[PDB]
Structure formats: C-alpha cells, structure tokens
Design a protein around this ligand. Structure first.
Ligand SMILES: COc1cc2ncnc(Nc3cccc(SC)c3)c2cc1OC
Length: 348
C-alpha cells in the first residue's frame, strides 16, 4: 500500500516524503540533488535522503537517474552502501517527476578519520581490507567505481568501512582543474586519457588511499594535471617501451616521451618505517601499467591481510546487466524504465 506523504520546504525545494521519515535536515546540495539527514522511524536508522534534481529534464539526466537507481538497487555487500528505500509522491507514470533515494547516513568519511585518530598499521590493515573486500564484490559485477577517495568511504565508530557515492556522471573539466582532491586519487591513464580504462583504475585509487593512511599525507597532491603526473612518475618511474605502445592517445604518448627517463623509487625509503608487507603491497598497486596491477581478489590474499583474510567471507556480486549504457532512448522511455524500477523496489 502507498504510505501517506507530507510536504515541507527545504531551501527553495518542497520535499514530499512518507511519514516514516522524520526530522529532515540538509547536509549538502549540488547539480546532482540536495541531500537531507533524517530518522526513519520505521527502522530506527539514521538515513540520507536524496531528492534528485530535475531527474527527467535532458536525455542525459533521465539516463543518469536510471543509472544511479539500477546501481544502488544492485549493491548488496557489507562494505558498500546499498539502497534502503526509493520513492515518489506520484501515483502513476503520468505524475512521476520526482525521485527520492534513501541510504544509510554517513557519520564520518575517511578524511574525518585520518585527521583524528593516529592510524596504526592494524587500522590500515582493516580499513584497506574492507575497501578491497567491497571492490572485489563490485568489480565482479563488472562495475567500476572510478572515483574512490577518502570522502567516498564511510567509517563508523568501530572502524567499519563502506564504499559509497559511485562515479555516475563525468566530472566537469573545472572539477578536475587545479589543486583538488577530486583528481589526486585518479589513475594516470584516466586522468590524462591514455587509453580506454577498466576496473583497474580503482586499484590505483586504493593505492593512493592506503599510502595516505600510512603517512597521513596526500600521496600525489598535484597542483594540476601535469604537476601530478610528475609527482606520480617521480615515484613509480617513467614508462618503458611496452607501456608506451599501449597508450592510444598519440598526443599523450608523445608528451610523455618528452620527459627525462626516471627510475622507480625505493618505496622502503619513501614510506619510512611502514610494515614491509604494506610496502610490498603498495608496489603491486601503484604500478604504472594497469595490466600489471594487483587485482582486488589477488590483494585480499596478500600476506599483509593474513589477519583479516577469509576466502569464505569475501562474496562476489550477482550478474549486473548494464546493457542499457550502450542503449539510445528518449526521455519518456528512460523515465518509464526508471519508474518500473521504483515500483518494483523491495527493502532489505
Ligand atoms: C554529513 O554529510 C553527508 C552524509 C551523507 N550520508 C550518506 N550519503 C550521502 N550522499 C549520497 C551520495 C550518493 C547517493 C545518495 S542517495 C541516499 C546520497 C551523504 C551526503 C552528505 O553531505 C553532502
């Protein structure tokens, strides 16, 4: 049955939610859609409620909406934020114009963590293990988060981590410009468009993240795209002939060849005092050639995680059909597909 809804204005926006959600309080608004913290009286959970902005304006917006609902509906793993609820005040496709997504509410992201506690090696072990446990699950559904950063990792009091806020759009050039954390964790091949990327870009992100946890500092705080590439190549060394071939972009490849050849540095001396196993793992993750990076599944079996590794409790995901990504449709067609997904939802 259709629950009853109530209305209220939350910053030039009239929110219409089911009675079960009480005490809505904003936390941030963007080109995506404003988000409110709220208490779901039906479950006793602190929840984040996102009201998508003009979900079915452009063909682009209509697809993004569908994309995000399909993705959130699929994620069902302890280390990934799934969907708790999705709803709309509309009573038919005809009325359907607004979409609200509900998920667990993030108390503190990983940054929040790196600036308070003094992460011990064990903490690093447990935090990175969880990210890799969730990535394995994600990459197995052939889903690429492609935007892993401290701010996209929720961590509770018990240091339990969940991966959220997947890459569902395409950051504007401006977003990625300058001295910004929105680019420091990006693999080089994606940041400079060397070639068509794959799930391996996330492992590079995990690498940058893990280094920051151990040193408490950003690994590659480039002031811009170029500076960051230099910061990266100074550590992992310039690319050899084999990697150069794999770089499709002739411009990008030609640019790299203009740089003086540098050798990969000794990570033991960069991460002074870091657990030798941690050092070794960082070397297998921060490999310039994505084909040779360690995979999430391979990393979970690494000696550094011996303490937490358990082959029987690192589940893969159900097949995720995203054939729609390559499909061209109209706004109304994307809206109905979206609608059906809303009317077919089932809480956990
Ligand atoms: C305390 O701060 C915040 C807490 C949040 N808790 C969970 N998800 C968020 N964002 C988000 C990302 C992707 C999909 C959805 S749908 C529920 C919502 C949040 C945003 C915040 O700040 C802006």
């Amino acid at each position: 049955e259709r629950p009853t809804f109530y209305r209220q204005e939350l910053n030039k926006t009239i929110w219409e939610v089911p009675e079960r959600y009480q005490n809505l309080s904003p936390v941030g608004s963007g080109a995506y859609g404003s988000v409110c913290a709220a208490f779901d009286t039906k479950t006793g959970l602190r929840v984040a409620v996102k009201k998508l902005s003009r979900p079915f304006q452009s063909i682009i917006h209509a697809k993004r909406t569908y994309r995000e609902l399909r993705l959130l509906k699929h994620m069902k793993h302890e280390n990934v934020i799934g969907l708790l609820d999705v709803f709309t005040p509309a009573r038919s496709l005809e009325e359907f114009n607004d979409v609200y997504l509900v998920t667990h509410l993030m108390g503190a992201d990983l940054n929040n963590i790196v600036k308070c506690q003094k992460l011990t090696d064990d903490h690093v072990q447990f935090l990175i293990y969880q990210i890799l446990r969730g990535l394995k699950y994600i990459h197995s559904a052939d889903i690429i988060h492609r935007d892993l950063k401290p701010s996209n990792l929720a961590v509770n009091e018990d240091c339990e981590l969940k991966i959220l806020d997947f890459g569902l759009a395409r950051h504007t050039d401006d977003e990625m410009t300058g001295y910004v954390a929105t680019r420091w964790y990006r693999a080089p091949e994606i940041m400079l468009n060397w070639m068509h990327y794959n799930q391996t870009v996330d492992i590079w992100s995990v690498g940058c993240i893990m280094a920051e946890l151990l040193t408490g500092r950003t690994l590659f705080p480039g002031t811009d795209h170029i500076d960051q590439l230099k910061l990266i190549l100074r550590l992992v060394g310039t690319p050899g002939a084999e990697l150069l071939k794999k770089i499709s972009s002739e411009s990008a490849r030609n640019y790299i060849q203009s740089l003086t050849q540098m050798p990969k540095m000794n990570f033991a001396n960069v991460f002074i005092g870091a657990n030798p196993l941690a050092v070794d793992l960082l070397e297998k993750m921060l490999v310039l050639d994505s084909d040779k990076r360690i995979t999430a599944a391979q990393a979970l079996a690494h000696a550094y995680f011996a303490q937490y590794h358990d082959p029987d409790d690192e589940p893969v995901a159900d097949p995720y059909d995203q054939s729609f990504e390559s499909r061209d449709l109209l706004i109304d067609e994307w809206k109905s597909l979206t609608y059906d997904e809303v009317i077919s939802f089932v809480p956990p």
